[PDB]
Amino acid sequence: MEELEQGLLMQPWAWLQLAENSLLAKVFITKQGYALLVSDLQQVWHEQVDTSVVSQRAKELNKRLTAPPAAFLCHLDNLLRPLLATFSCDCVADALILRVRSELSGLPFYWNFHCMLASPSLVSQHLIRPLMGMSLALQCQVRELATLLHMKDLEIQDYQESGATLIRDRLKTEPFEENSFLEQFMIEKLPEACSIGDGKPFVMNLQDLYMAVTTQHHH
Amino acid sequence: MEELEQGLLMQPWAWLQLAENSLLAKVFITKQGYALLVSDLQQVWHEQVDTSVVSQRAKELNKRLTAPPAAFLCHLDNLATFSCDCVADALILRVRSELSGLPFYWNFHCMLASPSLVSQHLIRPLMGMSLALQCQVRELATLLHMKDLEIQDYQESGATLIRDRLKTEPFEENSFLEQFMIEKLPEACSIGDGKPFVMNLQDLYMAVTTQHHH
Numbered sequence: 001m002e003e004l005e006q007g008l009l010m011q012p013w014a015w016l017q018l019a020e021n022s023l024l025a026k027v028f029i030t031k032q033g034y035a036l037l038v039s040d041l042q043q044v045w046h047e048q049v050d051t052s053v054v055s056q057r058a059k060e061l062n063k064r065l066t067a068p069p070a071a072f073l074c075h076l077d078n079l080l081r082p083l084l085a086t087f088s089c090d091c092v093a094d095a096l097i098l099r100v101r102s103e104l105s106g107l108p109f110y111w112n113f114h115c116m117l118a119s120p121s122l123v124s125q126h127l128i129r130p131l132m133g134m135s136l137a138l139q140c141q142v143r144e145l146a147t148l149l150h151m152k153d154l155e156i157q158d159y160q161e162s163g164a165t166l167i168r169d170r171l172k173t174e175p176f177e178e179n180s181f182l183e184q185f186m187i188e189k190l191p192e193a194c195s196i197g198d199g200k201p202f203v204m205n206l207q208d209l210y211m212a213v214t215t216q217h218h219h
Numbered sequence: 220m221e222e223l224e225q226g227l228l229m230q231p232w233a234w235l236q237l238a239e240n241s242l243l244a245k246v247f248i249t250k251q252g253y254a255l256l257v258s259d260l261q262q263v264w265h266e267q268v269d270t271s272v273v274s275q276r277a278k279e280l281n282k283r284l285t286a287p288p289a290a291f292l293c294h295l296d297n298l299a300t301f302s303c304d305c306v307a308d309a310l311i312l313r314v315r316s317e318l319s320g321l322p323f324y325w326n327f328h329c330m331l332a333s334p335s336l337v338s339q340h341l342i343r344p345l346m347g348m349s350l351a352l353q354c355q356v357r358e359l360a361t362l363l364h365m366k367d368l369e370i371q372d373y374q375e376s377g378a379t380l381i382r383d384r385l386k387t388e389p390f391e392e393n394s395f396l397e398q399f400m401i402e403k404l405p406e407a408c409s410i411g412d413g414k415p416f417v418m419n420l421q422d423l424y425m426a427v428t429t430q431h432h433h
Contacts, residue, residue, distance in 0.1 A: 041343065043334050117334060120262050128337075129260065131345040133408035135423075136415055138352035140407040141399060145359035148390060152366040155385050159370070165378040171369045176362060185355060186426055193354040194347030194427045202346055205353055212400055213408045 001048050004028050004035035009125060009214060012207040015200050018087035023098075024199040025084065026126075029077035031070050037126060038096060038115055041199055044123050045096040045115030061110040075104045076111060133213040134206065149176040220269060223247055223254040228339060229428045231421035232258075234414050235301050241412040242303070242312070245340070248296040250289045256340055257310060257329055260413055263337050264310045264329035280324040294318055295325060347427040348420065363390035 007028035016023045024039045033050040049057075054069035079085055085102030098113035118126075153175050159165055185193075195201070226247040235242040243258045252269040268276075273288035300315035312327035332340075367389050380386065409415070 041346075042338055120331070120337075123334070123337060123342075124261055127342050128345065129410055131342065131349060132260075132410055132416055134349045135345060135352060135420055136410075137399075137404055137408040138349060138356060139419055139423075140403055141356045142352065142359060144399065144403070145356065145363065145395075148363055148387075148395075149359060149366065152363065152370065152387050152390075155380070155387050156366065156370055156373070158380055158382055158385050159373045159378055162381050163373065163378055165373060167369065167372045171365075171372055173362075173366050173369050176366075181358075185358065186423075189354060189358075190351055190426060191430055194351040194430055196343050196346055196350075196431070199346075202350065206349060209349075209353075212404060216405055216408050217410070 001033065001035070001050065004030065004033060004048055008035040008037060009218060010211070012211050013199070013203050014084035015198070015203045016084065016087070018089050018098075021089045022198045022200070023089065024203065027077075027080055027084070029073055029080070031073060033069075034073065034076070036098075036113055036115060037118060037122065038098065038113075039118075039127070039199070041196055043096075044118035044127065046118035046122055047113055047115040057112070061112065065104075065107065065109070067104075071104070072109075072111075075102075075109065076100075129217060130210055130213045133217060134209050137209070137213065146176070146178045146181075152176075220252060220254075220267060223249060223252055223267060225432075227254045227256065228432055229425060231425050232413070232417050234412075234417040237301055237303060241414070242301075243413045243417065244312075246298070248292050250292060253292065253295065255327060255329070256332060256336065257312060257327070258341075258413075260410055263332035263341070265332040265336060266327055266329045276326070280326060283321045284319055284323065286318075291325075294323070343431060344424060344427045347431060348423050351423065351427060360390070360392050366390075 005028075007030070008026060011026035011028055013024050013026055016025050021040075024041065025037065027034055027036045033048065033054060035048045036046065038045040051069045054072050058065065058067075058069070058072045079100070079102055085100065087101075088099040090097045090099065094117050096113075096115045098115065100109070100111040100113070102109050102111075156173075226249070227245065230245045230247050232243045232245050235244050240259055243260070244255065246253060246255045250270070252267065252273065254267040255265070257264045270288040270292070273291055277288070277291050278285065294316070295314075298314075302313045302315075304311050304313075308331040310327075310329040312329060314325045314327070316323040316325075370387070371389075
């Protein structure tokens with residue numbers, strides 16, 4: 001394993017849909033096996049699989065296929081890269097089972113992802129820590145942009161206050177005040193702005209920042 | 220004790236100073252008991268207690284003094300010397316205060332937090348905070364672009380600057396992100412000991428948690 005986990009850490013979160021259910025998920029597949037991580041925004045599920053496990057489960061699932069685990073693994077990777085054939089999601093006690101129904105070389109292929117609850121180590125490394133790093137960095141952005149904004153106000157004031165001049169008037173901006181900026185933001189905008197939703201917008205507005213935090217945290 | 224869990228979702232995180240590490244702690248105290256969540260930014264611990272446990276535990280820990288459970292709780296609400304030890308999945312957080320002019324002892328008996336509270340107390344709110352900060356970034360950027368349009372009007376026709384050092388370079392988002400990622404991100408994304416988290420985010424934290432719950 002080991003290399004799987006390490007590749008998993010550099011994977012971003014994607015969005016997946018199946019039978020109305022959605023999941024956040026990332027996967028790192030090699031010829032050695034895969035690591036998978038899945039969250040419904042309530043629990044987090046994990047699986048790591050090796051070559052031995054692939055052979056055993058593909059045989060049990062497909063009572064008529066013959067290939068090395070490599071074939072089974074490359075098909076799974078070429079099925080899940082673009083997406084991130086048809087899926088379903090079942091729970092049993094603490095575990096999650098992600099089912100695949102699809103075809104390899106014109107023959108139907110069945111695979112079940114078997115995920116146990118992710119350990120606290122994973123949930124920290126893949127969710128908590130990076131997410132907390134993003135918020136900080138974003139809070140730096142805000143601060144750096146507010147200083148940018150006050151610097152543009154000293155410039156226009158230099159035009160109006162002293163430059164001794166005026167404009168077309170249809171463009172005069174209000175002086176920027178971060179106190180009133182926040183207050184209007186956090187009465188008027190926050191209610192939808194912090195919407196966890198389907199994890200759908202998190203994977204589409206934030207992943208570049210997510211990757212950059214993880215690379216940093218790990219290097 | 221169902222209300223105690225509810226009230227906990229919306230307390231901010233405190234930072235705690237220890238000998239070998241620091242902890243993050245949020246806590247909700249009533250006359251009914253307490254609920255605490257602690258974290259070292261690797262693991263998360265939980266404890267919920269009622270007033271039955273309070274008097275047994277205080278009687279064990281304190282010989283110099285006694286008092287009704289609700290008063291002990293009220294003094295803890297006040298919340299100091301902190302130490303801890305970790306046996307397997309237990310964190311025992313030890314506190315040392317001064318009540319009635321005498322030493323006072325309290326130990327938090329903390330087990331590994333359920334995934335469900337990790338989600339409710341960190342992941343969901345933390346994710347919410349990131350989406351909210353990103354809308355802000357957006358609104359500042361638009362605001363910056365508006366102010367350029369304004370200043371480009373003065374530049375368009377005559378109008379000279381007096382102080383030959385005030386010029387702002389025109390705001391272009393993609394490059395601002397570019398410089399931020401090389402020049403600022405390394406320091407600014409560093410979790411550290413959690414102190415940054417407690418120093419500049421607990422207002423947004425209290426606002427997101429309360430939004431989410433309502």
